[PDB]
Amino acid sequence: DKPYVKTESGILYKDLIDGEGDPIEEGDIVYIHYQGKTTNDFRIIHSTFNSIIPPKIRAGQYDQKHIRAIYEIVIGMKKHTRRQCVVPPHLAYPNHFPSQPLLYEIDVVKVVKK
Amino acid sequence: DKPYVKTESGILYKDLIDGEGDPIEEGDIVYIHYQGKTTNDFRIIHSTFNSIIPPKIRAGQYDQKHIRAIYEIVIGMKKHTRRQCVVPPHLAYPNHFPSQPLLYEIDVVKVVKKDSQGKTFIEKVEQKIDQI
Numbered sequence: 001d002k003p004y005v006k007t008e009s010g011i012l013y014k015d016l017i018d019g020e021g022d023p024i025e026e027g028d029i030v031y032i033h034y035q036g037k038t039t040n041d042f043r044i045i046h047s048t049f050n051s052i053i054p055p056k057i058r059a060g061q062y063d064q065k066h067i068r069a070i071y072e073i074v075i076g077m078k079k080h081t082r083r084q085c086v087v088p089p090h091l092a093y094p095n096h097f098p099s100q101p102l103l104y105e106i107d108v109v110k111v112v113k114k
Numbered sequence: 115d116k117p118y119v120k121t122e123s124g125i126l127y128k129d130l131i132d133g134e135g136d137p138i139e140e141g142d143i144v145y146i147h148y149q150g151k152t153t154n155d156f157r158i159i160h161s162t163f164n165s166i167i168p169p170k171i172r173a174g175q176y177d178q179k180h181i182r183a184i185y186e187i188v189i190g191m192k193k194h195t196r197r198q199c200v201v202p203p204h205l206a207y208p209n210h211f212p213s214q215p216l217l218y219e220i221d222v223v224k225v226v227k228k229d230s231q232g233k234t235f236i237e238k239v240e241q242k243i244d245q246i
């Protein structure tokens with residue numbers, strides 16, 4: 001059973017599955033799947049698992065297609081890492097879930113180095 | 115007084131306060147305070163001065179947390195240097211302020227090139243009890 005580590009940005013995270021290989025760096029292309037849940041009524045607000053192809057991002061490069069936290073938090077993950085994240089509202093949906101942290105679990109599927 | 119020095123990227127800067135110690139190099143972790151203003155009407159668009167702990171960046175490594183110009187212009191600054199900067203749109207807000215330069219003043223509060231940034235106080239103590 002693992003503690004959370006807190007980023008400067010206010011994300012709490014821990015790795016539920018360590019994964020293996022070289023850790024993702026800023027600028028890497030990363031294919032991911034994830035789900036996010038409310039912490040007040042525990043409901044799934046978003047799950048990508050039903051997309052054929054996993055969505056891809058560039059690590060550390062916010063491009064408005066996912067919550068801000070995800071672009072940051074993939075850094076340091078490896079292929080098959082599963083990272084559980086307690087996400088503060090300013091990095092998720094400050095206009096839809098303004099008051100509560102959201103709980104995300106993110107799976108890295110594939111990494112293409114920059 | 116002094117002229118602006120222009121970088122290749124178009125940052126025009128002068129040091130208002132020289133600073134002390136070794137110059138900042140790419141990759142150094144730097145705590146900075148800054149404010150930026152429009153030159154059309156000189157209103158403040160951003161100020162860090164309400165943050166008791168100043169934002170920190172790695173010199174020369176844009177991470178999208180601050181305007182691009184900042185990561186470049188810390189290089190060669192020192193602890194306590196204050197640099198006044200005329201910044202071109204491509205390095206600031208290329209959509210929001212596409213048509214004017216912006217005026218920034220950046221102060222370097224602390225440089226950590228150290229990795230001497232080990233743990234302190236109760237954290238340090240509890241860490242050591244966790245080797246042994």
Ligand SMILES: [Cl-]
Nearest residue numbers: 016017082105
């Ligand atoms: Cl799991």
Ligand SMILES: [Cl-]
Nearest residue numbers: 093094095096
């Ligand atoms: Cl929102």
Ligand SMILES: [Cl-]
Nearest residue numbers: 097098099100
């Ligand atoms: Cl809420």
